[PDB]
Amino acid sequence: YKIAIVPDGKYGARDADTKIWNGMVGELVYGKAEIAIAPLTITLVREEVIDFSKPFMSLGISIMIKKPQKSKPGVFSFLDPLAYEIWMCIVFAYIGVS
Amino acid sequence: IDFSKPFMSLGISIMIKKPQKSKPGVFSFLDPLAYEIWMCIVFAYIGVS
Amino acid sequence: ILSVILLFMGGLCIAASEFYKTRHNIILSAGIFFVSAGLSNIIGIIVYISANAG
Amino acid sequence: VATPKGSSLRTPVNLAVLKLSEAGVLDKLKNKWWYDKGECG
Amino acid sequence: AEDLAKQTEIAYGTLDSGSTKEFFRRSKIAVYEKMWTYMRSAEPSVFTRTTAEGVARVRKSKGKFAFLLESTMNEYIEQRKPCDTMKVGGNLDSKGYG
Numbered sequence A: 001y002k003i004a005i006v007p008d009g010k011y012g013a014r015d016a017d018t019k020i021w022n023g024m025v026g027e028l029v030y031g032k033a034e035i036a037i038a039p040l041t042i043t044l045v046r047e048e049v050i051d052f053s054k055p056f057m058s059l060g061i062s063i064m065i066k067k068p069q070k071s072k073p074g075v076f077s078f079l080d081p082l083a084y085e086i087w088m089c090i091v092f093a094y095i096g097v098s
Numbered sequence B: 001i002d003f004s005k006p007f008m009s010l011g012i013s014i015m016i017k018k019p020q021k022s023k024p025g026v027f028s029f030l031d032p033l034a035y036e037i038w039m040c041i042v043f044a045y046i047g048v049s
Numbered sequence C: 001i002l003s004v005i006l007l008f009m010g011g012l013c014i015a016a017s018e019f020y021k022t023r024h025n026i027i028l029s030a031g032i033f034f035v036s037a038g039l040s041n042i043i044g045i046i047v048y049i050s051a052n053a054g
Numbered sequence D: 001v002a003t004p005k006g007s008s009l010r011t012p013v014n015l016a017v018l019k020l021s022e023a024g025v026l027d028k029l030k031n032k033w034w035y036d037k038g039e040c041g
Numbered sequence E: 001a002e003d004l005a006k007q008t009e010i011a012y013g014t015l016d017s018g019s020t021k022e023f024f025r026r027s028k029i030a031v032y033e034k035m036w037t038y039m040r041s042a043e044p045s046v047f048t049r050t051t052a053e054g055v056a057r058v059r060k061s062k063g064k065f066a067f068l069l070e071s072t073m074n075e076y077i078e079q080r081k082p083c084d085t086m087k088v089g090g091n092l093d094s095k096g097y098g
């Protein structure tokens, strides 16, 4: 074989206006390459012009989120259960009761 | 024969019994506070005294 | 590292109090050094564990 | 899905399965007989 | 994905041109049909342009942008530094490369 990058850079698709396949699919239907070893998804629209092989990689649509981590609890994180104003007003009430 | 495109994809998977809660432990009253907290409490007690 | 510096100074104070018996204040110094060395080794433990966590 | 080698129903079956995957039927069928008909919750 | 649909804090976005948007548009499942309606008229447009752009937005939104892409790219991204992305849940569909 002889590896040859697709000039267009498109995986495959039908314009739908001039119905000219562009990409790897077009590079096969129109006698340009004999094999497409690429992450070419198997779809009905493409199956009517080429014959895929059995899937070599089963995949799907997943969910990606930003990786989380520890919350490094602050040194003085034991005073959270009460707001700052309560803490300030507890000292005031203490100095006043005494 | 000629198989068609897979109508479903599967694989070898691990099957277990669902964790039925957990049997308790003798010294399971110390679970809230971590080991280090308990250790440092002893050190702070020996120090304040 | 400061606990090791304080424990060493405690030994000097204890040794000094073996050649100068008249000065009773060289023995209290040893006690404070040792006690303060212990207190500095608690912050080390906590700092170690605390920092090692995150 | 398997067919006898050389049969004329190979290609039509291949497209029938593929269309049902894009449409979502093959996934609706699974959830029906695995979870909707379930007994755990 | 049901969890994301209920939530309105963390935004989620597919790509404009591709199969990850057609899937939601044509989906007859309520858990996905609900997401398509929101994602369609929601502003600002969560729909991104390039796969690289979507990865950056997740990494530049501080756990506020969820990207829906292929399970292969996500695992590769997740295993390539900065290492600030991860894979959650399971594949919403089943495709293959042939």
Ligand SMILES: NS(=O)(=O)c1cccc2c1c([N+](=O)[O-])cc1[nH]c(=O)c(=O)[nH]c12
Residues within 6 Å of the ligand: A011, A012, A039, A040, A041, E015, E017, E018, E019, E051, E069, E070, E073
């Ligand atoms: N890189 S990507 O961002 O995840 C991605 C985004 C959008 C379309 C993709 C696609 C990938 N891909 O992953 O390899 C393969 C692929 N293959 C096809 O045949 C097709 O039509 N569209 C695609």
